[PDB]
Amino acid sequence: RFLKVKNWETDVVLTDTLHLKSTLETGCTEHICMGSIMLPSVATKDQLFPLAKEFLDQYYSSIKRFGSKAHMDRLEEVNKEIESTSTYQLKDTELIYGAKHAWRNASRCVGRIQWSKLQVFDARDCTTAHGMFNYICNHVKYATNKGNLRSAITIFPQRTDGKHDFRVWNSQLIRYAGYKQPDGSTLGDPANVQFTEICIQQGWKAPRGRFDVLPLLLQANGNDPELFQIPPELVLEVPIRHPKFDWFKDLGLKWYGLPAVSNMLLEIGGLEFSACPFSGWYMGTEIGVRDYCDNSRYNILEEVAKKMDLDMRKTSSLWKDQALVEINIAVLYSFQSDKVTIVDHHSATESFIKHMENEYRCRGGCPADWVWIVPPMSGSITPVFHQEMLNYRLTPSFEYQPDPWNTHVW
Amino acid sequence: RFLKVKNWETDVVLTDTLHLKSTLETGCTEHICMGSIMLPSVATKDQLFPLAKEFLDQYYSSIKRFGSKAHMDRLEEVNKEIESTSTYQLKDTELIYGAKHAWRNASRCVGRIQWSKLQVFDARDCTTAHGMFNYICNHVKYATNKGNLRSAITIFPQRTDGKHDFRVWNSQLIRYAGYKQPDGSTLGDPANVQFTEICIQQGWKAPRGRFDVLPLLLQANGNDPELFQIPPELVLEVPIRHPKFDWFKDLGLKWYGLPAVSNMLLEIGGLEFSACPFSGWYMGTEIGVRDYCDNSRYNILEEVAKKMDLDMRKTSSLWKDQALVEINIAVLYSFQSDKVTIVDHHSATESFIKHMENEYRCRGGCPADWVWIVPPMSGSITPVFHQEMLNYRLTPSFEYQPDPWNTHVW
Ligand code: HEM
Ligand code: HEM
Ligand SMILES: N=C(Nc1cccc(CNCCc2ccc(-c3ccccc3)cc2CN)c1)c1cncs1
Ligand SMILES: N=C(Nc1cccc(CNCCc2ccc(-c3ccccc3)cc2CN)c1)c1cncs1
Ligand SMILES: C[C@H](O)[C@H](O)[C@H]1CNc2nc(N)[nH]c(=O)c2N1
Ligand SMILES: C[C@H](O)[C@H](O)[C@H]1CNc2nc(N)[nH]c(=O)c2N1
Ligand SMILES: [Zn+2]
Secondary structure, eight states, rough: OOOOETTTTTTEEEOOOOOOOOOOSSSOOOOOBBOOOSSSOOOHHHHHHHHHHHHHHHHHHHHHOTTTTHHHHHHHHHHHHHHSSSOOOOHHEEEHHHHHHHHHHTTTTGGGGGGGOOOOETTTTTSSHHHHHHHHHHHHHHHHGGOOOOEEEEEEOOOOOSSSOOOOOSBBOOBEEEEEEEEOEEEGGGGGGHHHHHHHHOOOOOOSSSOOOOOOOEOOOOOOEEEEEEEEOGEEEEEEESSSOGGGGGGGGGEESSSSEEEEEEETTEEEEEEOEEEOEEEEHIIIIIHSSTTTTOOOOHHHHTTTTTSSGGGOHHHHHHHHHHHHHHHHHHHTTTTTEOOOHHHHHHHHHHHHHHHHHHHSSSOOOOHHHHHHSSSSSSSSTTTTBBOOOOOEEOOOOOHHHHOOOO | OOEEEEEEETTTTEEGGGGGGOOOOSOOSSSOOOOOOOOOOOOOHHHHHHHHHHHHHHHHHTTTTTSSSHHHHHHHHHHHHHHHHOOOOOHHHHHHHHHHHHHHHHHTTTTTTGGGGGGGEEEOOOOOOHHHHHHHHHHHHHHHHHGEEEEEEEOOOOSSSSSOOOOEEEBBBOBBOOEEESSSSSSEEGHHHHHHHHHHHHHHHOSSSSSOOEEEEOTTTOOOOOOEOOOOOOEEEEEOSSOOOOGGGGGEEEEOOOOOEOOOEEOOOOEEHHHHHHOOOOOIIIIIIIIISSTTOOOOOOHHHHTTTOOOEEEHHHHHHHHHHHHHHHHHHHHTTTTOEEHHHHHHHHHHHHHHHHHHHHHOOOOHHHHHHSSSSSSSGSSTTTEEEEEEEESEEEEHHHOOOHHHHO
């Protein structure tokens, strides 16, 4: 009931008691571990108050006023609001706490050493897609900060009945389009082929190229979603060059500076925020390994190995690995030479171990998803490979949610 | 009760029903996933017969004579032997089945496409450490096969009372020694510093160098273990050169051809074989990434990056990654140019996916430990990174066991 996690590169042992506070379930059982399943699986007033109480008890505990008078009155006040409306409203402070701790609690996120320095934009007064556009533009501008990127989240009104959701239909605020071709190939980002055509369905005039920034498809208060184009000046992009290979620029690769996930759901005290785009900055491998080198993505190991004049005749020449390192040196170099925030997988994984020690010390644990924390290349030469991690579900939290076009009564 | 695993690089879906046959437990619960914990945790006649029956039922099922007369007689015969002796003896055929399926069931093993082509050496008539030496030498000679390596297992007598165990005290039949220095550094393999000194305690005269093959410490029928030196001619080694960098030979690196784990316990029908050294061949990354480049192992990223004249001033130059690829190209090249069996992580992981499809098809599942199946470099450019895997414990199985010097009443 007081579990131990060991680091086998350092022989460091941390004791986890925070998992005792875990509420949700993991997918694993006593007889089957589901740690590698990608996705693991209306709210009534009866279920709502325990969740509110739990949250308010940790909120008031954190500001060193647990059991104080303001706590009991707020507990009473939220119960009375749940009785009347079968829901309730968070104070601005409780909203900022919840979002920060949802990030703190995101076990798949290696970037959490920064969780307390999160900028919370309260967009709960928003009523229209245009207002969402406005809020999102201000989010992008603020988080981008001329390349000195800043963590931020914009929180649209919470789900109520269920038929009146706010959704950003983009999976990220800034993504490149993906078009299939006559010959069945894929121009741009294959990940977004369906979403690109959804925008073309709703009326997007596509500039059928590679790195075309998709429009925003914004649904407000359950209404049908509406297209908006982010001002190009707000979309900071990095052309990818290599510090040695001058042909690398001829690849014409570029990526956007700001990673901003917009398809997740934020849970705070049983309240559900279906539109809560959050942004930080990139770990280099996200672009250089996954985005560029996944087979089902841009898939450029082919061309880079060619230009490096690599032995591509069999697997065992490791030409794939060799080109993968050059690509990631190029992403990091390009971002840093442009003063656009980025972190290499070595710095970020070391920071995550330091983060883990802090959390185990000043919190009794740190839920962590090894499958997702270990970077997609160079696993074992980073310290997280050798770090045992306990995964468990704490709340406030970020949850997955269906794509809105699969669920929306149209 | 009929779980689905998806490959997200291929959109392939496999349905797992074999997990229903799972007996042991995983360490995970509904509320906590332990998929990244390295190690997860006398036998009476009462518990013994269900385990025998279970095993014999799958054995006779596999030879298409389940419920036949020979099955019932063997079930009766083993029950009568458990009644009399509170244990029993496997037929040679049942021993070969059990070992093969223990390997088939090893969820952390990416090499299992070969599980049915395993050479089983029955050493259950062995009574002394010298007989163990003999058997082990013949194992090494056979499995090595002049570089055309062959899978094999040597199975010493099963545990009886518990105080009469056969143990190989080496973690692998062939490992390099590790010596600490006056300046507290480490010559050779730091992994084996304690075991190297244990041999020096029992009387090994150490040639305090780098790649000194350790002696065998063999315990037979519970007696104190005894030192034996494998004939050098039986120990096949590969000098590590690079196909491009001629200074690479000046590193003077070499590794042994034959990976043969000797510290695990083989469970077959409730019977426990505490000495069961098994060998196959190397996946390249085991040597080139873990053995050479773990901080707590040979730790040669330092020197290789130096000779490559790499920018070693900060992490973000990826000099560590770059040197890691060159080292693994060198291991694969050196082994292949010497006709010593080796498999690169690309070929082995592709084979494991093919293996998985076979098992799900002709067996309903394949327990798999993603944390261990994904190679320690280039994770996501291999197909197992994108493959969801269910981990669960099937028997016959290979289990960990305490190091014998921690348990042996001396
Ligand atoms: C500040 C720099 C940040 C870095 C370097 C970072 C890095 C990462 C990485 C590499 C992942 C793995 C997911 C993937 O590979 O697609 C991840 C996951 C995640 N991050 Fe962070 N992140 C940062 C900021 C944030 C912020 C500000 C939030 C929330 C406010 C957040 C919440 C999450 C969540 C919920 C996941 C899980 C995603 C999923 O399950 O698909 N991260 N992060
Ligand atoms: C034939 C070629 C083989 C290859 C390429 C191979 C490869 C691997 C690799 C890379 C691992 C990961 C463990 C580590 O990184 O230390 C592993 C684990 C394992 N293998 Fe295989 N193996 C082979 C043969 C065998 C055989 C013949 C057996 C048993 C008879 C076996 C049983 C196991 C077991 C029990 C584990 C889990 C080890 C642990 O939990 O520490 N393997 N294998
Ligand atoms: N630095 C960052 N990174 C990052 C952080 C959180 C989440 C993500 C993206 N996580 C996507 C995981 C995923 C989910 C679904 C599918 C998928 C694909 C096809 C069909 C169905 C589902 C695929 C993937 C990744 N293959 C990136 C940041 C982005 N914002 C703030 S920080
Ligand atoms: N190709 C092969 N590979 C392979 C297969 C099975 C097992 C292994 C070795 N698995 C070792 C995992 C391990 C266990 C304990 C400790 C440890 C270290 C210090 C203290 C306590 C425990 C460390 C490690 C690895 N870091 C390699 C083969 C070897 N034979 C036949 S195939
Ligand atoms: C099958 C597997 O769960 C899937 O590919 C996961 C593995 N680990 C990951 N880790 C990160 N950071 N991002 C991912 O998309 C994935 N994908
Ligand atoms: C903490 C973690 O479980 C540990 O380092 C594991 C991770 N995955 C591994 N995978 C393999 N193949 N071999 C290992 O030694 C390990 N070590
Ligand atoms: Zn699990």
